[PDB]
């Protein structure tokens, strides 16, 4: 019964799992904004 | 080692934000921290020494040739094609053709970053720039083709990092579950967007009480995994406020399989491009910029200086997975 919902600005780290680096960070305030 | 590049992430991130704090930020501070890295290859003196403490690496704990070697080891992994996975990363160096360079420097840059020299005429500007556009292009499968869009045309020399990344969700999002739904950038403003939507999944999952975030990990099996940060809504401030090696590493390890009744993501793609010039001064890699550089490790005279460094990322977050590119590009001038 947990819902995770991803409808307010939000942060991704893409991270390789051996190496431990990151390869990619990004914070989503605004899915529209050009 | 890796413990380096997590905190020139964070340092840079932060960097990003303060420059303007509402607005999305996407980047690759391996990219980065690789274009850098690479460049030090041929800086001597206060020159080396700022910008790979600017990378946050301990010389006294590790030594230049140890840093290479370290690049160099990862670059390699960073190039695989599976079902699940796309990974490439690539070094050039776009170079005036009359140029003398060093041979230690082209056979190091070669061994250690993959980099090829490419001859190239600055002076005709608009061609320079296609070549390198391209070499990114084909290197990022289309998606950044604009890296470069002023160019001196008495430049010596640019230093390029691409990377290209895509991935297949291992739970896929069904298409015929995406819906228009509110997106809040803030408790009274809010958009429509897609959002994607899954039922009954089971992810590594982590709820802080004391930071007021959810944090889930997607696609968490094999070579790469993404781990997702949801702040309460109000909250993101306070949590990028918290951001660190340390707390990432309790993110990590407070992780814990759980099953989800739905999970609501957007489908977008965003992208966003930067002058570096004003963060790597701030982050005190300072000499490379003046006339002071000493970058004769490249050429046998101190006759090159950093004049700007660029940076270009795209993400795009789809049912079926994700699709991320960047690409860095110092730019160099004589002296
Ligand atoms: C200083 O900590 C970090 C700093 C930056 C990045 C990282 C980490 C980190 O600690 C880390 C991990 O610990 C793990 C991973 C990882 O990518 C990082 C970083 O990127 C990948 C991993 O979760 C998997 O392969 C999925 O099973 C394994 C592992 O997770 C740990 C904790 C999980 N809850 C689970 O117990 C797993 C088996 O070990």
């Known amino acids: ?34 | 080692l890796a413990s380096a590049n997590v905190d020139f992430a964070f340092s840079l991130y932060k960097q990003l934000v303060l420059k303007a704090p509402d607005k999305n930020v996407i980047f690759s501070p391996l990219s980065i921290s690789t274009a850098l890295a690479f460049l030090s290859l041929g800086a001597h003196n206060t020159t080396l020494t700022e910008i790979l403490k600017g990378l946050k690496f301990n010389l006294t704990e590790t030594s230049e040739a140890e840093i290479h070697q370290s690049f160099q080891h990862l670059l390699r992994t960073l190039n695989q094609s599976s079902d699940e996975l796309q990974l490439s990363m690539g070094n050039a160096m776009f170079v005036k053709e009359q140029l003398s360079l060093l041979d230690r420097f082209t056979e190091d840059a070669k061994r250690l970053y993959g980099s090829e020299a490419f001859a190239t005429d600055f002076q005709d500007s608009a061609a320079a720039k296609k070549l390198i556009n391209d070499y990114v292009k084909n290197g990022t499968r289309g998606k950044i083709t604009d890296l470069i869009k002023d160019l001196d045309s008495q430049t010596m020399m640019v230093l390029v990092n691409y990377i290209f990344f895509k991935a297949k969700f291992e739970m896929p999002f069904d298409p015929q579950d995406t819906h228009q739904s509110r997106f809040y950038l803030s408790k009274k403003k809010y958009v429509m967007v897609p959002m994607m939507s899954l039922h009954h999944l089971t992810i590594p999952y982590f709820r802080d009480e004391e930071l007021s975030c959810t944090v889930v990990q997607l696609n968490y099996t094999g070579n790469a995994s993404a781990l997702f940060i949801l702040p309460d809504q109000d909250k993101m401030e306070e949590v990028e406020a918290m951001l660190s090696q340390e707390t990432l590493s309790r993110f990590f390890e407070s992780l814990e399989f759980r099953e989800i009744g739905e999970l609501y993501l957007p489908k977008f793609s965003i992208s966003r491009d930067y002058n570096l010039n004003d963060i790597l001064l701030q982050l005190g890699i300072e000499e490379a910029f003046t006339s002071k550089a000493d970058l004769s490790g490249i050429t046998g005279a101190r006759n090159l200086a950093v004049s700007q460094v660029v940076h270009k990322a795209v993400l795009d977050v789809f049912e079926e997975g994700t699709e991320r590119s960047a690409a860095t590009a110092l730019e160099v001038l004589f002296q």
């Open chain 1, 1 to 34: 019964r947990t819902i995770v919902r991803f409808n307010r600005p939000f942060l991704m780290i893409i991270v390789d799992n051996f190496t431990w680096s990151i390869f990619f960070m990004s914070k989503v305030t605004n899915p529209k904004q050009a």
